[PDB]
From a paper:
Our initial AMC009 consensus gp140 applied the SOSIP.664 design, but when trimer design improvements became available, they were used to create the AMC009 SOSIP.v4.2 and SOSIP.v5.2 variants. Differential scanning calorimetry (DSC) experiments showed that the midpoint of thermal denaturation (Tm) of AMC009 SOSIP.v4.2 was 68°C, which is comparable to that of BG505 SOSIP.664 (Tm = 68°C). We used cryo-EM to generate a high-resolution structure of the AMC009 SOSIP.v4.2 trimer in complex with bNAb PGV04, which targets the CD4-binding site (added as a Fab). A 4.3-Å-resolution structure, resolved by single-particle cryoelectron microscopy (cryo-EM), revealed that the AMC009 SOSIP trimer indeed resembles the native Env trimer. Overall, its structure at 4.3-Å resolution was similar to that of BG505 SOSIP. One notable difference was that the longer V1 region of the AMC009 SOSIP.v4.2 trimer adopts a more disordered conformation than its BG505 counterpart. The AMC009 and AMC011 SOSIP trimers have an apparent intact glycan shield dominated by oligomannose glycans. Thus, the predicted accessible protein surface areas of the AMC009 and AMC011 trimers are 172 Å2 and 33 Å2, respectively, compared to 2,377 Å2, 1,649 Å2, and 1,153 Å2 for their BG505, B41, and AMC008 counterparts.
We describe a new recombinant native-like envelope glycoprotein (Env) SOSIP trimer, termed AMC009, based on the viral founder sequences of an elite neutralizer. The subtype B AMC009 SOSIP protein formed stable native-like trimers that displayed multiple bNAb epitopes.
Numbering used by the authors:
A (entry chain L): 1 to 27, 30 to 91, 96 to 106
B (entry chain A): 35 to 58, 66 to 134, 150 to 184, 188 to 310, 313 to 323, 323A, 324 to 355, 357 to 397, ...
C (entry chain D): 126 to 134, 150 to 184, 188 to 214
D (entry chain H): 1 to 35, 35A, 36 to 52, 52A, 52B, 53 to 82, 82A, 82B, ...
E (entry chain B), F (entry chain F), G (entry chain E): 523 to 550, 569 to 664
Amino acid sequence: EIVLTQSPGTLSLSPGETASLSCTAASYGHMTWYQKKPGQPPKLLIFATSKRASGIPDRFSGSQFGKQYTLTITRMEPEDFARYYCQQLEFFGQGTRLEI
Amino acid sequence: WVTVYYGVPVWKEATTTLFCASDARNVWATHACVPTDPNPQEVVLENVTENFNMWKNDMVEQMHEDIISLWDQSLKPCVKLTPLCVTLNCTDYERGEIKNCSFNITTSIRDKVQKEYALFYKLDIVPINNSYRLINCNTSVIKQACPKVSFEPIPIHYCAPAGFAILKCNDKKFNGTGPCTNVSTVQCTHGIRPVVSTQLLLNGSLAEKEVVIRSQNFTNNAKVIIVQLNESVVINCTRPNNNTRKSIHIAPGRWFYTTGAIIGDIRQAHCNISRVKWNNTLKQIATKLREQFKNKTIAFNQSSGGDPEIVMHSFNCGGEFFYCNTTQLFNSTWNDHITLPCRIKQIINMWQKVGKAMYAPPIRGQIRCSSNITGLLLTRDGGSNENKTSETETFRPAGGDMRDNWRSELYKYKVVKIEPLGVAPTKCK
Amino acid sequence: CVTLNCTDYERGEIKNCSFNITTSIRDKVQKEYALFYKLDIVPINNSYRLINCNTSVIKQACPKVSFEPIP
Amino acid sequence: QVQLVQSGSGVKKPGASVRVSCWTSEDIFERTELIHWVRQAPGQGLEWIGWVKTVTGAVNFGSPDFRQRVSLTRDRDLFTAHMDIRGLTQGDTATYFCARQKFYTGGQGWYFDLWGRGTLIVVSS
Amino acid sequence: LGAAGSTMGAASMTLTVQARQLLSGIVQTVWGIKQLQARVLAVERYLRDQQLLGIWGCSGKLICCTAVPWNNSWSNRSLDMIWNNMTWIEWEREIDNYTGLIYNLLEESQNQQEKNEQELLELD
Amino acid sequence: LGAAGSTMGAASMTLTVQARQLLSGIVQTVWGIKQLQARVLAVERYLRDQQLLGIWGCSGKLICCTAVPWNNSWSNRSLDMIWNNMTWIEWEREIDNYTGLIYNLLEESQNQQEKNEQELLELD
Amino acid sequence: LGAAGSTMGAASMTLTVQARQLLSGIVQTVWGIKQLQARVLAVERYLRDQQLLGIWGCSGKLICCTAVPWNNSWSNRSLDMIWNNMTWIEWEREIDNYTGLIYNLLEESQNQQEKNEQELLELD
Ligand SMILES: *[C@@H]1O[C@H](CO)[C@@H](O[C@@H]2O[C@H](CO)[C@@H](O[C@@H]3O[C@H](CO[C@H]4O[C@H](CO)[C@@H](O)[C@H](O)[C@@H]4O)[C@@H](O)[C@H](O[C@H]4O[C@H](CO)[C@@H](O)[C@H](O)[C@@H]4O)[C@@H]3O)[C@H](O)[C@H]2NC(C)=O)[C@H](O)[C@H]1NC(C)=O
Ligand SMILES: *[C@@H]1O[C@H](CO)[C@@H](O[C@@H]2O[C@H](CO)[C@@H](O[C@@H]3O[C@H](CO)[C@@H](O)[C@H](O)[C@@H]3O)[C@H](O)[C@H]2NC(C)=O)[C@H](O)[C@H]1NC(C)=O
Ligand SMILES: *[C@@H]1O[C@H](CO)[C@@H](O[C@@H]2O[C@H](CO)[C@@H](O[C@@H]3O[C@H](CO)[C@@H](O)[C@H](O)[C@@H]3O)[C@H](O)[C@H]2NC(C)=O)[C@H](O)[C@H]1NC(C)=O
Ligand SMILES: *[C@@H]1O[C@H](CO)[C@@H](O[C@@H]2O[C@H](CO)[C@@H](O[C@@H]3O[C@H](CO)[C@@H](O)[C@H](O)[C@@H]3O)[C@H](O)[C@H]2NC(C)=O)[C@H](O)[C@H]1NC(C)=O
Ligand SMILES: *[C@@H]1O[C@H](CO)[C@@H](O[C@@H]2O[C@H](CO)[C@@H](O)[C@H](O)[C@H]2NC(C)=O)[C@H](O)[C@H]1NC(C)=O
Ligand SMILES: *[C@@H]1O[C@H](CO)[C@@H](O[C@@H]2O[C@H](CO)[C@@H](O)[C@H](O)[C@H]2NC(C)=O)[C@H](O)[C@H]1NC(C)=O
Ligand SMILES: *[C@@H]1O[C@H](CO)[C@@H](O[C@@H]2O[C@H](CO)[C@@H](O)[C@H](O)[C@H]2NC(C)=O)[C@H](O)[C@H]1NC(C)=O
Ligand SMILES: *[C@@H]1O[C@H](CO)[C@@H](O[C@@H]2O[C@H](CO)[C@@H](O)[C@H](O)[C@H]2NC(C)=O)[C@H](O)[C@H]1NC(C)=O
Ligand SMILES: *[C@@H]1O[C@H](CO)[C@@H](O[C@@H]2O[C@H](CO)[C@@H](O)[C@H](O)[C@H]2NC(C)=O)[C@H](O)[C@H]1NC(C)=O
Ligand SMILES: *[C@@H]1O[C@H](CO)[C@@H](O)[C@H](O)[C@H]1NC(C)=O
Ligand SMILES: *[C@@H]1O[C@H](CO)[C@@H](O)[C@H](O)[C@H]1NC(C)=O
Ligand SMILES: *[C@@H]1O[C@H](CO)[C@@H](O)[C@H](O)[C@H]1NC(C)=O
Ligand SMILES: *[C@@H]1O[C@H](CO)[C@@H](O)[C@H](O)[C@H]1NC(C)=O
Ligand SMILES: *[C@@H]1O[C@H](CO)[C@@H](O)[C@H](O)[C@H]1NC(C)=O
Ligand SMILES: *[C@@H]1O[C@H](CO)[C@@H](O)[C@H](O)[C@H]1NC(C)=O
Ligand SMILES: *[C@@H]1O[C@H](CO)[C@@H](O)[C@H](O)[C@H]1NC(C)=O
Ligand SMILES: *[C@@H]1O[C@H](CO)[C@@H](O)[C@H](O)[C@H]1NC(C)=O
Ligand SMILES: *[C@@H]1O[C@H](CO)[C@@H](O)[C@H](O)[C@H]1NC(C)=O
């Protein structure tokens, strides 16, 4: 069983527009989101409870209401064109990347 | 018209310090507690339900602070080991579990310092040649328990202050969370004996019909699941040897005690638990765990971790500290006596408090212990992203947090405050 | 509470006793003397120890504290 | 973004062991409930390795291979933790990271609030 | 608290029947410290409630008359609608949003206004 | 306690005359600790007695009316037989075996039954 | 204490209006010790005043009737002379020299004599 999966995986973006990413997982429950740039550890963006993490200037948010969670990325700012991952306790998604 | 009433049977969740009460100094110096009422019967509140949460319940936190405080109050004035923290020259007398070590002791309440010897366990020794230091003769302070002070758990009752009440959940198989539909109230809780153990819980209350398992979040592997049996599994434990004790003068008013001699031959401490009851117990637990996890094969895979206080099963016996090999118990798997070598330690890192430790005095052999074995503290072993390969859940023994031992009993209680005033409309002058 | 070398000054009820004192709030320990009663002395030669310089703890009353019974 | 201090990078021969340390400030250490370790091999997503509990030294693992080859320990006097990996293979080349979780209740999930910079462990001929 | 299991209408007698306070009085070295503090708290809570009854023009009564009409702007229910079916636990859930208003009104109408009239009657 | 020297009949006036409580109120670091505890105890005892008077339908009165007939099954004496000759100290020796019964009866007849009737009168 | 700014005549209403006690109840490890002692003191002061009202034949009233005539041997003033112009702060300055006499008189006339008459009325 693949407990946690992530998609679209590869996203073709146009800065100024808002992007969205999502994860689905077995047994539901809360799930977090993180993002990284090459050479760095990932930063927390979204708390498992969908609360925004400190240090983020109100760019990322989302909701569940199912086994799925979806968040949006405000204006597709290039500053956030990081590799994104979901986490559900011991499981991670394979991640996604935002590209222009 | 607003009519004023007094004596209105309502309450709200509230936190307040609970009063200590007894059935009638050691550690549990309950002579300082107020004896409970005779026939301390409860009141069943028909048509009253209440919402409980054993992992939020502050009664556990208060209990935690009392047990620590009492332990320190009783150890505070006792002889220090610290003045003896010197490097010693030691010989080897299963090998050399108990060793005869010696030094030119600089205490002995004298200027004319002298050679003296003592018998210590290897378990408390850090090699430093054949020289050594004790494990807490480093950056920590060691005090010895007073020879006059026993631990003596004693059942302790906690009582609401007047103006407060304790609501008890009597709803069969309640898991400590959410609404309880069988609620009754008392001024005081039943008496709960302090239990000092890891991995397996000792005598305490049992489940009503079948083993029940409780968790704040069963899918969160960082949490420990508490398993409450509906029957006990008795175990006997001994130290089948004889010994003597010797004193060292540390301070003019204080003596330190070590083993003076090994009498008869040397034999390992061990426990003997019914094999049938144990095997049935794990099958019952696995059955209920399967319901919690729907339908996976469940295995018990021994303990793992670092420190032996967590890895080995531990318990107090009289004033003695036992660590036992439960690898012989947490075995096998289901998808439908036993002898445990043990070790005796003298230096105890109680409460896992950094910078402090207690030294236990000798009991001169003949240790005889027993317990009921009423429950397990378990954690799940793992899981990770996998390419749809296989399954089977496994569990291991857990411990080190005394609040779970208390929580395993306190889960049935909630503290509320009584608010006797209120109004309602009628008609009046 | 050290062993001291003492002389005899009804005989020698009050005696001048001495030792290389290891307190004196210093590393450079020194000889010092004091006058004590024989009544508080256990012979240990002419050496001795005090009666409670054995298995008991001795504290001195603060010089600023009187007893003063008071009704 | 508080950083944790890790042991450095290096190359090991197959069968070798590596000591991966992670030190932090005394308050950062004390406010942490769990120390997590993760692995990110080049081209791979993030793999959870396991955790060690900050008070007891208790552990949990992702893969059973880590359960057998990786020892996760803690030291409360030093305000450190370690990941001792034995039996290294070329398949274990990855950046290894230490991170810490400040979260303690049910319903919260697992967190990486604090991070080290990662260490690159290379295993080769 | 046995009375908690029934309606507030039933409690027109069971409040009275229950009667007994479970607060201070008749119901009433780390452990020594905690016990002393618990005793002090029971006293403080007891007196706070008694002082409120006093200021409202009430005394050592289980049931007390007011001089304040019920206001439907708070909660508009028939009397049967609350006395039957509803319990005291349920009832207070709405009153929590009005209690402060109610208490201020009780003080003025039942006690302050009445005592000023009585002083005039005494001098007269 | 000067009144202790006479009969309970004499005390029909000397209880009243004595009046003053010798408990809390108007009469009212190891020593600091003991003094604080003594003060708390005086308060607790005071309130326990006042709460009993309240629950019985009594108030801040030296003499209080009941709604409970005397029961000769407890102690059968003429009134003159107790008020004359006997003192209060002597009297309580028999009452100790009935006090609990008496108190429960006082609560119901004088207060609980009367307050329920008054509520009906208020609504009427 | 806002009422402190006016006359005692004005206070015939402002005492009543003020109403609320600033003592115990509704208003209510070195710091832990001091806080506990402060709480105990508030209770003691509260009860001392309440006990005095009780012994005088007074109850939980802001204004209470006596059975003692004013004595001009203490202070001979017209009523208008005190109620107008003078404040309560000023008034008590003279009463401090008579307060003890007054209190003893209040106890006897309003409570002790009346309670003895009531006992006779109850037996009658
Ligand atoms: C470990 O910790 C995790 C948290 O990290 C807990 O997870 C929560 O578990 C509860 C209980 O299952 C979940 O609550 C459920 O929410 C559902 C809401 O979604 C509905 O509506 C959306 C609309 O888009 C639908 O897509 C979706 O399918 C649902 O329809 C409720 O529906 C659930 O049940 C309720 O409604 C049904 C409707 O018929 C009733 O029949 C039920 O009786 C009930 O009323 C339920 O409320 C909660 O969402 C979980 N959290 C998260 C974040 O997923 C774990 O439970 C916890 N595990 C343990 C063992 O403790
Ligand atoms: C679970 O029950 C056991 C069984 O009672 C409790 O501990 C045991 O209590 C007995 C009490 O008689 C101890 O016996 C001791 O024997 C020595 C022999 O000389 C005597 O001197 C002592 O005064 C005492 O009688 C026995 O050793 C002791 N065993 C242990 C393990 O302490 C046990 O405390 C209960 N545990 C809980 C959590 O309730
Ligand atoms: C309970 O007692 C057992 C004693 O048998 C303790 O663990 C045992 O430790 C020995 C030594 O490491 C293990 O044997 C070793 O096996 C490897 C396998 O390749 C071999 O190479 C070594 O030369 C040696 O033989 C033994 O298997 C192991 N047994 C178990 C059950 O783990 C055990 O730690 C004790 N546990 C507790 C909680 O006290
Ligand atoms: C308790 O934990 C031990 C390990 O710490 C478990 O033993 C391990 O079990 C796995 C699966 O059976 C073994 O893997 C197999 O080894 C054979 C050896 O030729 C191989 O042919 C298979 O393809 C597979 O690799 C593993 O070697 C074994 N490890 C040891 C040290 O024995 C044990 O099963 C656990 N207990 C329970 C009840 O699960
Ligand atoms: C709630 O649980 C209590 C458990 O004590 C049940 O009452 C007990 O019923 C047994 C039956 O023989 C009696 O022997 C006990 O004496 C009863 N307890 C008490 C305190 O009297 C009670 O019936 C349960 N209530 C509900 C609603 O299930
Ligand atoms: C857990 O159970 C297994 C299975 O019975 C034990 O392994 C057996 O140990 C006996 C000991 O003499 C061997 O003769 C068997 O051949 C072993 N079985 C296998 C399949 O190897 C195992 O030792 C038990 N674990 C513990 C700690 O007792
Ligand atoms: C719990 O609720 C039930 C009904 O909701 C109560 O039963 C009522 O009891 C009165 C007592 O005389 C009867 O007149 C009613 O007819 C009963 N109702 C029904 C539907 O039979 C029961 O008493 C409640 N429990 C408590 C403690 O009040
Ligand atoms: C002690 O007892 C004696 C008698 O037993 C009391 O004397 C009585 O006092 C009243 C007071 O008016 C007289 O009327 C009686 O005639 C006296 N009796 C006799 C026999 O002379 C005396 O007062 C008692 N002491 C106290 C404190 O009451
Ligand atoms: C302070 O004193 C002045 C006068 O001494 C008070 O003023 C009086 O207020 C009443 C209120 O209705 C008026 O009727 C009087 O005519 C006012 N007097 C004068 C001379 O104008 C003032 O109120 C006092 N302050 C307080 C707090 O009472
Ligand atoms: C004290 O701690 C240091 C830390 O590494 C250790 O090396 C040393 O052996 C310890 N000494 C004792 C007696 O434990
Ligand atoms: C077990 O916990 C769940 C949590 O939602 C609860 O609904 C259920 O009723 C509990 N079990 C019992 C016996 O109350
Ligand atoms: C578990 O499944 C295996 C599969 O072959 C089976 O052999 C074994 O007997 C099962 N265990 C039980 C208790 O039925
Ligand atoms: C287990 O619990 C029973 C309960 O009565 C008790 O009598 C017994 O001593 C306890 N201990 C053992 C080892 O049976
Ligand atoms: C591994 O992942 C691939 C992804 O498509 C999946 O098709 C395959 O079934 C998975 N596992 C196995 C054992 O085949
Ligand atoms: C201490 O006590 C022992 C007991 O016999 C005695 O022999 C010795 O002389 C004592 N020493 C002093 C200083 O009193
Ligand atoms: C209160 O009224 C509702 C109306 O549907 C009814 O369902 C409920 O059972 C009633 N409760 C009681 C205690 O009569
Ligand atoms: C009470 O009556 C007895 C009867 O003999 C008598 O002896 C006694 O003196 C009387 N006591 C008083 C106080 O009158
Ligand atoms: C009180 O009377 C005196 C008489 O001269 C006057 O001066 C004073 O202002 C008056 N005070 C008030 C408050 O009226």
